[PDB]
Design a protein around this ligand. Structure first.
Ligand SMILES: Cc1cc2nc3c(=O)[nH]c(=O)nc-3n(C[C@H](O)[C@H](O)[C@H](O)COP(=O)(O)OP(=O)(O)OC[C@H]3O[C@@H](n4cnc5c(N)ncnc54)[C@H](O)[C@@H]3O)c2cc1C
Ligand SMILES: [Cl-]
Lengths: 296, 5
């Protein structure tokens, strides 16, 4: 019964669209299956993508989808892949809707999910006054006051970086004590350290400490953990590695996973993290998937 | 970028 495609792309955001476009342009049959929840759906503007700086993320996604579907040999389903299987006839995908699809090759482009720190008030401000990436949102703080919400060893790096964008306070949240050398480095960067446990976030970006003090900020940054959006990579036996902030699907320098005929791009790979990176490694994955189609 | 790059 199930429909056959040369390639199925799982995830239809920046990475998946970029990959799908290469395959479409190679005159092969490509299907995108997308569950419609992009990582960046919380901010009203996108930055750092040359040719799209300042544009709305929904508009970026919309334009990309329209220009992919301009290729008759490209198709789209609004659905969620729940199960992936490797058979002799390639790969078989089962969706939440019940639909089955088959493909010779797969591109995984399903992104990651931010696991936010358990701090009252943080979630409702995510993408408005609380962020993850200073290259994406630092500039618009206008050199103002920036709080770095500590959550273990890696937060130190964020604190060291943040003075590029404004006056920084490293809120260690009683979780990580910088060593002697670290305190000196932070001092010479002009970073103030506040060690008190955090009670909650109020106002736009004001941190209320356990002792009742309130410190107002123009923006807050968290170096939060992230998970893979989908167990599909794991179901296909792709090697998954633990990065500094969570798991990523291992790939070679052509975006192929440890499972032949399965490629990966976007945030789920080692060097993802921004839209520009997703566009680039998505394109790479698509051309590589096509090469494997042709040459085996 | 997955970190400082
Ligand atoms: C608040 C915020 C602001 C950001 N701002 C910027 C910015 O300004 N500039 C920038 O370059 N980057 C920004 N980023 C980073 C950026 O969002 C990512 O780098 C980028 O979206 C990753 O693209 P993707 O195609 O790899 O993942 P995603 O955009 O997260 O999309 C993955 C897609 O796959 C779908 N999917 C998931 N599971 C399944 C499944 N089982 N079956 C089918 N489909 C599935 C999802 O629904 C989703 O549509 C921001 C991130 C956040 C959180
Ligand atoms: Cl961000």
């Amino acid at each position: 019964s199930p429909m056959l495609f040369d390639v199925i792309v799982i995830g239809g955001s920046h990475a998946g669209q970029s990959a799908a476009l290469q395959i479409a342009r190679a005159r092969r049959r490509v299907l995108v299956i997308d569950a419609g929840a992009r990582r960046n759906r919380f901010a009203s503007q996108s930055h750092g993508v040359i040719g799209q700086d300042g544009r709305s993320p929904d508009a970026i996604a919309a334009d990309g989808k329209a220009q992919l579907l301009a290729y008759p040999n490209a198709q789209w389903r609004e659905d969620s892949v729940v199960r992936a299987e490797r058979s002799d006839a390639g790969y078989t995908l089962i969706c939440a809707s019940g639909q089955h699809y088959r493909a010779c090759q797969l591109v995984l482009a399903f992104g990651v999910v931010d696991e936010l720190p358990e701090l009252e008030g943080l979630e409702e401000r995510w993408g408005e006054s609380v962020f993850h990436c200073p290259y994406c949102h630092g500039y618009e703080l206008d050199g103002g006051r920036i709080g770095v919400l500590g959550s273990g060893p890696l937060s130190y790096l964020s604190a060291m970086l943040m003075p590029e964008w404004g006056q920084t306070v490293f809120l260690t949240d009683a979780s990580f004590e910088p060593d002697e050398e670290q305190r000196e480095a932070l001092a010479r960067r002009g970073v103030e350290i506040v060690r008190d446990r955090i009670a909650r976030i109020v106002d736009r970006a004001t941190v209320e400490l356990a002792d009742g003090r309130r410190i107002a900020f123009d923006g807050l940054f968290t170096m939060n953990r992230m998970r893979l959006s989908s167990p599909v990579a794991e179901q296909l036996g792709c090697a998954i590695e633990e990065g500094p902030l969570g798991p990523y699907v291992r790939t070679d320098d052509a975006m192929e996973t440890s499972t032949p005929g399965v490629f990966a791009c976007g945030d789920i790979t080692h060097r993802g993290g921004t839209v520009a990176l997703a566009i680039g490694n998505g394109a790479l994955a698509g051309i590589a998937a096509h090469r494997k189609l042709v040459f085996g | 970028x997955x970190x400082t790059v």
